[PDB]
Structure formats: structure tokens, C-alpha cells
Design a protein around this ligand. Structure first.
Ligand SMILES: CCCCCCCCCCCCCCCC[N+](C)(C)C
Ligand SMILES: CCCCCCCCCCCCCCCC[N+](C)(C)C
Ligand SMILES: CCCCCCCCCCCCCCCC[N+](C)(C)C
Ligand SMILES: [Cl-]
Length: 158
């Protein structure tokens, strides 16, 4: 796939979120559906933002694929009440270099490789946790070649 870096300012947002140490990506994503179900039950009237912004924060300090520190986030228009370890928080504004990963998730690492190289080549520094923003996927497209996930590296120019 031919990744195409873009540079953008991402404003702050309010999210509901849950943080996990996960064995691998498949194990992690099985934990995601219950989060929305439980937070919505506990906060009638909670509204997702339009457009949506639904993303994983990868909090590890190095590249990893197993035993990962991940935080699932989904943007809402206003705060609700925390439900268990599901917590509302403000995710701060960042300047990000981004690429779109088309297709299934087994090759997501290629987008991270690409962005790590771009940051080095163009005189930037990664300054906060990468975000993995889910756009199109099994919820709306059964042709997995048409899934779309945006990888966002928070950066500052050196
Ligand atoms: C000079 C710095 C060298 C590289 C810094 C990399 C920091 C790593 C950022 C957090 C870990 C990202 C893990 C993403 C895994 C995503 N997939 C499971 C989908 C592949
Ligand atoms: C029988 C085959 C079972 C397939 C299970 C499919 C479950 C799909 C549940 C999707 C949850 C996706 C969460 C990402 C949120 C989507 N938005 C980006 C639109 C907010
Ligand atoms: C279980 C609900 C999963 C996600 C709901 C919305 C998916 C449909 C397309 C939105 C992009
Ligand atoms: Cl320069």
C-alpha cells in the first residue's frame, strides 16, 4: 500500500475511555464492543460526536505488538458519569503527522513503520502516544480491502 503523509492539527475532544494491558491486538479488540454498551446504558442521552472520532492510544514507550498498553477512546459531545473503569477525560490537542491505512489490520504495522521513518527523514520528533483512528471496518464494509484506519503520530518540528 502507498502511504501518503499529511500534517494536521487535531483539536481537543471529550471521550469515554478504558485502558488495558493486552496480550495482542486480537485479544484487545474483543474487549471493545462491551465498552460502548456499558457506558451508554449508564448515561442515557450520551451522544457520539459527528463526525465520529474513535481511536486507540498506544502508550508504550517503544514499539511493541504483544503485552501492549492501550487505551480505547470514543469522542462524545459532553461528559457523562464514569462507569467502572470506563472514564471520561479530555484528550488534548496535538499536531500530528498522519497516514491512512487501507485494508485489514494484519498489516497495520506497515503504517507505523512508515510514519516512524517519515518523522526521522523530515526533522520531527514523536512527542505523545500514537493514535489509531477507526473509520471504516467490519461495522460498515464487508470488503475488508475498503477498511480505513488513520494512524496519527503527535509530533513537533526539531
Ligand atoms: C526514536 C523513536 C523510535 C521509535 C519510537 C516508537 C514509540 C512506539 C509508540 C507506541 C507503540 C506503538 C504500538 C502500535 C502497535 C499497533 N499494532 C498492534 C496495530 C501494530
Ligand atoms: C458473526 C461475525 C461476527 C462479527 C462481529 C462484528 C462486530 C462488529 C462490532 C464493531 C465495533 C467497532 C468499534 C469501532 C467503532 C465504529 N465507529 C468508528 C463508527 C465509531
Ligand atoms: C456495535 C456498533 C459498532 C459501530 C456502530 C456504527 C457503525 C456503522 C458505520 C459508522 C462508520
Ligand atoms: Cl527542514
Amino acid at each position: 500500500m502507498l502511504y501518503q503523509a499529511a500534517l494536521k492539527e487535531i483539536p481537543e475532544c471529550i471521550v469515554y475511555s478504558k485502558r488495558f494491558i493486552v496480550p495482542d491486538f486480537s485479544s484487545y479488540i474483543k474487549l471493545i464492543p462491551p465498552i460502548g454498551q456499558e457506558v451508554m446504558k449508564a448515561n442515557p442521552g450520551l451522544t457520539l460526536t459527528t463526525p465520529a472520532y474513535c481511536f486507540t492510544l498506544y502508550h508504550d514507550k517503544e514499539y511493541k505488538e504483544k503485552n501492549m498498553d492501550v487505551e480505547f477512546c470514543e469522542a462524545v459531545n459532553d461528559f457523562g458519569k464514569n462507569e467502572g473503569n470506563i472514564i471520561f477525560q479530555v484528550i488534548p490537542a496535538i499536531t500530528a503527522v498522519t497516514v491512512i491505512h487501507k485494508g485489514p489490520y494484519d498489516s497495520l504495522r506497515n503504517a507505523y513503520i512508515y510514519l516512524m521513518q517519515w518523522v526521522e527523514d523530515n526533522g520531527y520528533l514523536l512527542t505523545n502516544s500514537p493514535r489509531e483512528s477507526y473509520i471504516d471496518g467490519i461495522w460498515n464494509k464487508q470488503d475488508s480491502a475498503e477498511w480505513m484506519t488513520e494512524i496519527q503520530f503527535p509530533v513537533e518540528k526539531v
